[PDB]
Design a protein around this nucleic acid. Sequence first.
RNA 1: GCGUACACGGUGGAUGCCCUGGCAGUCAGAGGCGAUGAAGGACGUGCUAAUCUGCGAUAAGCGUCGGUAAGGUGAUAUGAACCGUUAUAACCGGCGAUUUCCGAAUGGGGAAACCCAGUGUGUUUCGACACACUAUCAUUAACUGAAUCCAUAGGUUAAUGAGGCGAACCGGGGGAACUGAAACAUCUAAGUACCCCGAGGAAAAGAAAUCAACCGAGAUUCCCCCAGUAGCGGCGAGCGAACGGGGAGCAGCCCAGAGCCUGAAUCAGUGUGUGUGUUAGUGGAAGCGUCUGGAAAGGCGCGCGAUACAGGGUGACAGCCCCGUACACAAAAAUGCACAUGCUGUGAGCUCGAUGAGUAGGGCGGGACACGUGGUAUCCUGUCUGAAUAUGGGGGGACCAUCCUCCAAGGCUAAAUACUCCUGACUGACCGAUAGUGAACCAGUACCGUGAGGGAAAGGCGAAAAGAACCCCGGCGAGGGGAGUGAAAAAGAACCUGAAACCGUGUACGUUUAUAUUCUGUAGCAAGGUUAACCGAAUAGGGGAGCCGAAGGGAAACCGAAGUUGCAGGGUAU
Lengths: 148, 35, 95, 61, 102
Amino acid sequence: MELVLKDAQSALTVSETTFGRDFNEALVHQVVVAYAAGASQKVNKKMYRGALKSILSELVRQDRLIVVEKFSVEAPKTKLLAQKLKDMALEDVLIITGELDENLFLAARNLHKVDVRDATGIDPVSLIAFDKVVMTADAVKQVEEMLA
Amino acid sequence: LKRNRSHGFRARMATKNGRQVLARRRAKGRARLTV
Amino acid sequence: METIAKHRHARSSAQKVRLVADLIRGKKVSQALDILTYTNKKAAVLVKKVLESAIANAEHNDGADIDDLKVTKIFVDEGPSMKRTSHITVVVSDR
Amino acid sequence: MKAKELREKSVEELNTELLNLLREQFNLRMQAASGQLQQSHLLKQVRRDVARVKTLLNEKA
Amino acid sequence: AAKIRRDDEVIVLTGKDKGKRGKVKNVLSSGKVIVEGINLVKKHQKPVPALNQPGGIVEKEAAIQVSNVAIFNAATGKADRVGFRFEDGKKVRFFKSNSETI
RNA sequence: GCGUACACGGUGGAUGCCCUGGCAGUCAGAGGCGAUGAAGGACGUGCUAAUCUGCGAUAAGCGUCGGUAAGGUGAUAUGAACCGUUAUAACCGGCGAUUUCCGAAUGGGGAAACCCAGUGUGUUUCGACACACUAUCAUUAACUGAAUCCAUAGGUUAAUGAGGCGAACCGGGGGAACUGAAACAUCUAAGUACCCCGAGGAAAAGAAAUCAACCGAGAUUCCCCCAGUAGCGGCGAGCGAACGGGGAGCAGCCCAGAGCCUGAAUCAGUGUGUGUGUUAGUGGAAGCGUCUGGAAAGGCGCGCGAUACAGGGUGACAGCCCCGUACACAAAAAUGCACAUGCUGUGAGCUCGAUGAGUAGGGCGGGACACGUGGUAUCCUGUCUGAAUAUGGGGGGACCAUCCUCCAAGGCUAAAUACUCCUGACUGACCGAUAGUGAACCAGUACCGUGAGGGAAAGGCGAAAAGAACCCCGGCGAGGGGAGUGAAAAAGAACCUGAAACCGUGUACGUUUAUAUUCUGUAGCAAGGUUAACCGAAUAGGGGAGCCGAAGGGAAACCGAAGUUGCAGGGUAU
């Protein structure tokens, strides 16, 4: 599908199977059950790819995924992140990116409603916990190459 | 005096059984191991 | 008005004290104590003590006219077992 | 207190400690037996002083 | 170190003594504090013929937690927090809220 | 005389709140202590009637150096009495002194906390007090030393090991009954419990005279598959491999004798300084008003901090009550971990040589070898005989040929690995006093058995004892009533919330986890999937020695198939 970066009026194309695949309730239920059990059960890469693609497509169809060119704070202060989130009127969002930023990670550390984690450490529980997810084009392509 | 001769601490210690029984008794932790 | 006098953990059989009290049930306090003065039962002393305590409390706190005081609610309950103990209760009022 | 007696020669330390342990101990025990010495910190201070003086004379010399 | 010590003026924030000021007399080892004229009790002391019995009911002061009383400063008249700083050769407590000097 | 229902009562604890409690796991050190007296007890030490803890007549402690230092003098659990309050109150830590008796207990005796001693030194007194020594076995060294000159046996002295206990692991030597074939023979139980020795915290072993044989893997040490395949058993129950194939680690050794040039890297011990920990600690963010409510931490309004909304408690649910946390710092002296650094002994590399000789093998007599020589075996004896040595041996299907190994009778090698008696920290789709530990409590206590051994029940006042001052009755007791505190006393020390069973009164009326088999659904992809063990700031992603399907079928002449892996469900086999 095609998504809007909402910061530069640039349209980005993504694989249909990722953001445009049908939502398989059984797969998501199985994945969340396995995650809860592991929090020993067999885990497969294909199952994880299917679940992440399904949840991402569902969120896109629900307008729960919004992407930005870059999300960071000029200084390692939580107030900067808080005011930046307030500007967009975002309170319960999941910040996902590529290489971890020391300033952004420090700012988001105390925020209970906001969690920061690496692209490779993405889990469905984090995606479903927060209402919306803020990612970046680099993170989007990283996820796309991870899922192949 | 028969009690001292029979259950005396030294008399018990004179034998290996006395040492092992008193050791396990202490392990249990009784206030009086023999008397 | 009402007056209360009770004893706890009395070292006596509950049934015996109940039977003794039944003799004075529904009777004037003055008449009850006068009759109990010569009673030879062991519980006679206990009932005398409780009634005198009741009248003393009435005269110290309640109003006068203690002679017309009447026996209203006298009972005994089984107590803790260590010869079962008993709890004696007397509620008396002129009315 | 702690260091005032440290500099003194061993002879006077021995004299004072022996005199204390021979006289003050008897006085305080008899007072306690008879009910005197209402304040008990005298026992504490005298016992500590005798212990401190006796701690010397072994490692110092 | 203790933020509250002798010769310190404090106000009880809650516990039937709101808005009343006083001076701390003693602090218990369990964290309780004693301030004259904030909490008067009616201890029913048992009379004794010796030991110079005060007589009748003694209207003394009970012990209250330090956490339930805040420190007072005369610079602004409102209770404020306190931290600790290092002076030229000693460490002393300094209030918060513009850092009033004790 | 009782019953039909209600209210008050007393032995009474079903129910519910958690706790100064236990239990299961994870990450690290330690993975032993001591004759310089191990572990544990007995008795004492407080202004003390008693307990925990500390200590030992110097007794809830002392000298020194650091941190903190204004409350403390340990608490249970109060009272009396103390010091100082800005560095000699008190608290924590390191370094030192003392440390009664029994206890291996070590001078002797002996009944555990008891008795009796001897030798030498100091005693400013020599009545008497303090200190050191006074046991046994074994070894090394020194001095003496009969038979017997020396040397030995014996004696004296200096030094070293052991006097015991400790949960588990390793090897070796023995080791049972219960045991299933409805008992039982070959066997399983089981080489389990148990007894002994050695000493290591990890141990032993640790680098081929290794296996197939004509191709091949190349140290020891642990792990999933192969694999419950072969094989073993009245082929039944049941037991049970690797050559070989992948992961952790992979380092090999040396001298085995001669020299050359040599004190050339390394090792163990011993100073200096650098960095991080152990060993006391420092700093460290931010809020009010009304309402409600005993009290706010309940919620309403608007604020601040957040590297810190992890957590503790504070009159009910706290970021801004604080203690704390994130984070930044800190050692006078002692201490581990790696460095450059001076020194004492080992001490590099090169060449030339042997390859650990009464040794391999062999004879007459056993051990366990399921089998007493029978279809028959390995280390060897009591003793004798007896190989060339690297040009040779073990040997390999014995063989010719060909091939691996050793270079044959020295041992060293931390690495990857089993476990926690105890120590430090964290967690609990674990329990809540009839549970959890036997014991949440003065519990391995009371108590029982003269010993082994067994073994309980017993908790919740009140947030704050602020404990019902006082007055009265009562016997100057016990008990109760007014008054008062207390939110409540339908919270009162016999004190958490509190239903009945039982007994009385008045009221209206009458008298088994787990290993397989099969079927159900659901989901991925597809002739594919799952990857095992492992790597991996970590259920991400890699990693298929390992499993089955499989453009194949068929008779490799010939023609030309869509299965697996997870989840939840059930029945069956013990």
